[PDB]
Amino acid sequence: VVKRTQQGNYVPVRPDHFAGVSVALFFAKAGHSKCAQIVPVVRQFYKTTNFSGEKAVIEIIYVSLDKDEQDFERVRALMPWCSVEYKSCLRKKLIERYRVPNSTAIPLLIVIGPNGEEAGRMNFQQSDEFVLQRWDYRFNKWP
């Protein structure tokens, strides 16, 4: 249901990865001006805070609101972190479960605690853009 992009194809994720670290899901959409704004910023933030060290302290699961297989594959061809599967109904389940309306809502990072329930809401539809790092990856590491 949750895929990782490798050299060549996609692979199902190993659930023991998510432990001992922090987890955020990224609600976004291709072809939005603000999503094209925020995608590379979170890219550079991820790479810096994860590869400035030995092992990973955070990870991102990308969830999409796109209307085509083609656009989904398109963004997944170049986005470095995890992704969800398009046909799996977990994606629409996560939408209705987490309250994104499908605008002034996307992009969104919902940081999730170990109980599958949120440990933070963070938005970009505001004047400030130094807000990526306002989120502690020290209080909320999963066991």
């Binding site: 550079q44 810096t48 805070t49 400035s52 060290g53 030995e54 790092q133």
Partner: protein, 428 residues
Amino acid sequence: MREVISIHVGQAGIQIGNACWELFCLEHGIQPDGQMPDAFNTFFSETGAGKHVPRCVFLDLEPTVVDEVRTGTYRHLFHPEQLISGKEDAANNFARGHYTIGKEIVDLSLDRIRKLADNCTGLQGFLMFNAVGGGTGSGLGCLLLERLSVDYGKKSKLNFCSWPSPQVSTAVVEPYNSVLSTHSLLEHTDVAVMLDNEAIYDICRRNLDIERPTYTNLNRLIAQVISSLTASLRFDGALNVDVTEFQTNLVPYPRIHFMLSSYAPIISAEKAYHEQLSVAEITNSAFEPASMMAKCDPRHGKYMACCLMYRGDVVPKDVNAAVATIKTKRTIQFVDWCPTGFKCGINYQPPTVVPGGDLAKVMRAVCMISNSTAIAEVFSRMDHKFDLMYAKRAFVHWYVGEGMEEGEFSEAREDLAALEKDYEEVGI
């Protein structure tokens, strides 16, 4: 315990020191995160658990150089409060960095200096990096250094000045910027080490044998001098020095503290096979005039004081062998009144090499900081650039309009006149 607080002001300061800090991180095995997988006390504090935050401050009136570090690979390495950005650039004015825009930064910066100095007693000194021909490099540099002298009485102040070239300048206002800095540098700093740019261009042309180095290769060699300078504090050696002893080592009168630099070996990894680096041969290259980092010809200079810090596996007596023959040689001319003129300290640990750098790993290294009367050439040339450009009041209204009093340029020159004459007086 004992430590030195470093200050970076102006762009030249920042990106030299950006190289200087990445050399220090790998010296003590500190990752860019700031953790480790009694060495690191003198340049780092410890925060919470497992961390090492630096003893540094970044100041600039433009965001463009300091925020780019904030997003670099050294994100969490610096605490995000001592990185200081203004709004608009100082723009090559002494006056603007001193009078109008310079005020609103010093009021917050001196606070962070206080915050960093109030941990332990026995401050060693202040290592402040700046350019001289620059705008914020002088104006913000002066206002910060003047306030620090009054607030903290007796602690030493090391100042590495990226001096304007004898030949190139890369700005027109350099003679107006350089002269005005000096009148406010004499009675503030304690050890001002003069560094050049095309010297290191000329060094990397000849010794390093690499066709096209950039500012990133200037800064590695600069970083290698600083590491060898403060090698004694970090690590034990057979014969150590301090940063509070240099001023008792080098200055005969309180107004004479303008010293050069030298370093050896500086060799490509490709030509390293043809040099087994011995103590007998590295010392001679240290005194060879086409190896110093200031570009002034010392053949018209009487040496006055010298301070060699050997690095690496060097035994004490072949140092004594080398220095015996050095003193008897008449190509290196010492002045009469100073019959002893050497200090040579020794440290154990050989110099690191940065990955992706242009230096072969060497086993021994010599770093030189010397007081000589050749600086009379560096200043009398500079005075010529002033009065020729001040012949009919070029660029005056920019300084006048920004806040300075016309005629303050006169006593700045009268000041530099005295610094011209005492060097001439000493050499006889």
